[PDB]
């Protein structure tokens, strides 16, 4: 029964899940100017063009938008990755004011919303047996700024209504990602884990340098969605992010100079 809460947010995920005391726990401040620049980081190899989506879910956390990842159809390679991660699902993280939202924080600034999108290594098999391994999960962070319209968001914007409260899906076919990217594929990397319970540290994360600017109107949507079920008292469908955690012994590695 954990969530976004008084009596059940990040702040008692511990007691539940003791790894949220972990090293390496995500999300972290990037300090932009600690980060070590590696100019042994090979650029990202973003291939998207296959992307397959299959359907939008509303798990009672966030939503989820979730791809055909029995092929590779839309993987992710390059960068500090060895090997091919399948994009498995994406989702977002947003905040009740445009002030915050985002996991991830660029000294210190907090974005309005950051998106995730998840990727599994291939040489696991599948989800179950990736998230099992220190390097079997690759999520691909991207911050959002309020701004001007991001038009690549307006089906999944559009279809929110549909999937309000927990436990509701719709067919979502036909949804390219990579109008979600921004223009530039600079990124920091550091080790980190899942920012939800379970919690594991299994991830290896790729938080791009320059966000995309999403219109007020498309972020007040997200803001429409529900934490609980049908028939259930409203409770809007906002903070759900986890604060910064300790870097510890961990060094974030930039591919810019
Ligand atoms: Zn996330």
């Known amino acids: 029964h954990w969530g976004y809460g008084k009596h059940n947010?990040?702040?008692?995920?511990?007691?539940?899940?003791?790894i949220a005391k972990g090293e390496r726990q995500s999300p972290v401040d990037i300090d932009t100017h600690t980060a070590k620049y590696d100019p042994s980081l090979k650029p990202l190899s973003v291939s998207y063009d296959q992307a397959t989506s299959l359907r939008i879910l509303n798990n009672g956390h966030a939503f989820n938008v979730e791809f055909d990842d029995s092929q590779d159809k839309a993987v992710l390679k390059g960068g500090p990755l060895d090997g091919t991660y399948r994009l498995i699902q994406f989702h977002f993280h947003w905040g009740s004011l445009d002030g915050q939202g985002s996991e991830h924080t660029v000294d210190?600034?907090?974005?309005?919303?950051?998106?995730?999108?998840?990727?599994?290594?291939?040489?696991?098999?599948?989800?179950?047996?990736?998230?099992?391994?220190?390097?079997?999960?690759?999520?691909?962070?991207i911050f959002l700024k309020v701004g001007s319209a991001k038009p690549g968001l307006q089906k999944v914007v559009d279809v929110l209504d549909s999937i309000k409260t927990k436990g509701k899906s719709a067919d979502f076919?036909?949804?390219?990602?990579?109008?979600?990217?921004?223009?530039?594929?600079?990124?920091?990397?550091?080790?980190?884990?899942?920012?939800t319970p379970p919690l594991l540290e299994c991830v290896?994360?790729?938080?791009?340098?320059?966000?995309?600017?999403?219109?007020?109107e498309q972020v007040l949507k997200f803001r429409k969605l529900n934490?609980?079920?049908?028939?259930?008292?409203?409770?809007?469908?906002?903070?759900n992010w986890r604060p910064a955690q300790p870097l510890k012994n961990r060094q974030i590695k930039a591919s810019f100079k």
């Open 9 to 18: 947010g990040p702040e008692h995920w511990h007691k539940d899940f003791p």
């Open 108 to 141: 210190k600034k907090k974005y309005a919303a950051e998106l995730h999108l998840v990727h599994w290594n291939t040489k696991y098999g599948d989800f179950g047996k990736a998230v099992q391994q220190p390097d079997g999960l690759a999520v691909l962070g």
């Open 173 to 195: 076919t036909n949804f390219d990602p990579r109008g979600l990217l921004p223009e530039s594929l600079d990124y920091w990397t550091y080790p980190g884990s899942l920012t």
């Open 204 to 216: 290896t994360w790729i938080v791009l340098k320059e966000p995309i600017s999403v219109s007020s």
């Open 227 to 239: 934490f609980n079920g049908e028939g259930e008292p409203e409770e809007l469908m906002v903070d």
